[PDB]
Swiss-Prot record:
It comes from the Eukaryota. It is found in: Nucleus; Chromosome. Residues 3-108 form the Bromo domain. Phosphorylation by CK2 disrupt the intramolecular binding between the bromo domain 2 and the NPS region and promotes binding between the NPS and the BID regions, leading to activate the protein and promote binding to acetylated histones. In absence of phosphorylation, BRD4 does not localize to p53/TP53 target gene promoters, phosphorylation promoting recruitment to p53/TP53 target promoters. Belongs to the BET family. The NET domain mediates interaction with a number of chromatin proteins involved in transcription regulation (NSD3, JMJD6, CHD4, GLTSCR1 and ATAD5). This is Bromodomain-containing protein 4.
Amino acid sequence: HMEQLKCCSGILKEMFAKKHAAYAWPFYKPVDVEALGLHDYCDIIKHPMDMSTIKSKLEAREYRDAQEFGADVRLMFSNCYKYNPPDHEVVAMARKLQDVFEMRFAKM
Ligand SMILES: CCOc1cc(=O)n(C)cc1-c1cc(NS(O)(O)CC)ccc1Oc1ccc(F)cc1F
């Protein structure tokens, strides 16, 4: 249980690294509704998620097991697929970052 949570920090650190930075940058900080002009984001997305919030929740003790961590990382991607159109640039970036997460998260 304790060993799994330490590995979860390693997955988040890889996602934050310069290697994946080209498609991981719109997921670093929370979705800015006022700056981008996304008036209906809070209406459609009920539970918003970002890499900084997952990092903060992990830095504390919000997740009991790795499954709770995974559910939050998958929520971040699910929010991107629900709100944005299927042909948007951020959707393709979410798929590439999910490919990185799913590969490392499965190997534990
Ligand atoms: C209209 C798309 O807006 C978003 C919806 C969404 O679901 N996500 C996860 C992110 C963004 C998003 C948020 C920020 N700015 S921010 O400070 O909030 C985060 C750094 C910056 C870019 C963002 O996306 C893109 C927008 C245009 C483009 F050409 C490619 C993009 F990738």
